[PDB]
Amino acid sequence: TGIIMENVTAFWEEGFGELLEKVQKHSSDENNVSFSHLCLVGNPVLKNINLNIEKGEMLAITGSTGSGKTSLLMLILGELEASEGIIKHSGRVSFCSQFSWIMPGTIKENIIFGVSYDEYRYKSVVKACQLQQDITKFAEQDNTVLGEGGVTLSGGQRARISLARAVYKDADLYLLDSPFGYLDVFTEEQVFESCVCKLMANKTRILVTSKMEHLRKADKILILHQGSSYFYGTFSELQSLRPDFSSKLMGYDTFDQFTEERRSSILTETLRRFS
Numbered sequence: 001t002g003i004i005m006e007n008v009t010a011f012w013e014e015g016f017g018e019l020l021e022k023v024q025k026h027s028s029d030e031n032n033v034s035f036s037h038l039c040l041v042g043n044p045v046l047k048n049i050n051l052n053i054e055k056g057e058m059l060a061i062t063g064s065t066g067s068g069k070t071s072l073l074m075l076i077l078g079e080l081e082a083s084e085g086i087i088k089h090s091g092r093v094s095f096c097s098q099f100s101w102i103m104p105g106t107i108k109e110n111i112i113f114g115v116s117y118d119e120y121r122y123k124s125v126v127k128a129c130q131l132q133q134d135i136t137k138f139a140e141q142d143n144t145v146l147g148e149g150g151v152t153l154s155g156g157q158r159a160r161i162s163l164a165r166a167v168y169k170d171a172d173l174y175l176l177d178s179p180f181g182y183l184d185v186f187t188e189e190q191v192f193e194s195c196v197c198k199l200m201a202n203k204t205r206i207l208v209t210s211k212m213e214h215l216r217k218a219d220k221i222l223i224l225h226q227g228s229s230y231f232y233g234t235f236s237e238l239q240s241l242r243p244d245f246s247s248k249l250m251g252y253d254t255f256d257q258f259t260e261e262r263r264s265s266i267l268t269e270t271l272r273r274f275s
Ligand SMILES: Nc1ncnc2c1ncn2[C@@H]1O[C@H](COP(=O)(O)OP(=O)(O)OP(=O)(O)O)[C@@H](O)[C@H]1O
Pocket: 020, 021, 030, 033, 045, 064, 065, 066, 067, 068, 069, 070, 071, 072, 264
């Protein structure tokens, strides 16, 4: 149907760490991580993961920083293998990574990169990703040549082009890894509404996020901590079965407009108090 994981565990295997680094602050937290040692010692990166996501549902994945969110995505992509447990999903998947990549060419060439052009499809993706506001600032609009790896664009601009590229792909499952992590916080709110909630309402999709509105709108929710499932279920269930986490995070007035670093800090801290 959509995607199922039953009691899945995945161990550190050689090369997986380098892959994670190739995508591309608590980097000071990571400074005696040795990917070799994790492989020697036999260590789960993800442990006892369960989820059942139906066709057209949206799973929101959140958690503490370094909890295995991207790794779970990689597991779906087949870059990590389940050592225990069952994973079912079929069909093409489309992946939007944390690192926004940009190829030599026009904005438009970037969004349809490697895929056939369809005008209604294109115009539709451009609009829902809120790119119309960006391209209208340029003399050649979406025919603007990105005369770098889009280096002179904003981080949000690069993230929107990269989102639009993944959303434009025709696929059965969309993996969206933290597109909404930048300062232009009102644009991100329109994008989430227009792209992820409306245009994609019937696409099975997984959104890694650190905003509570995304948990609120989600069909299902996975919270990760230290490579384990801190919680899995609906937003209603989260308020009942994790009441301490919930009231803390809904306690804020405008949590979703804090920086990405601050939201991830509060999430991480909250997950530790309440074990
Ligand atoms: N670049 C890196 N260097 C060293 N250790 C890393 C790096 N990226 C991830 N890790 C470690 O590998 C496991 C985590 O990664 P994943 O990359 O799956 O985290 P996330 O859950 O995606 O978190 P975040 O997005 O906040 O980094 C964790 O135990 C984490 O500490």
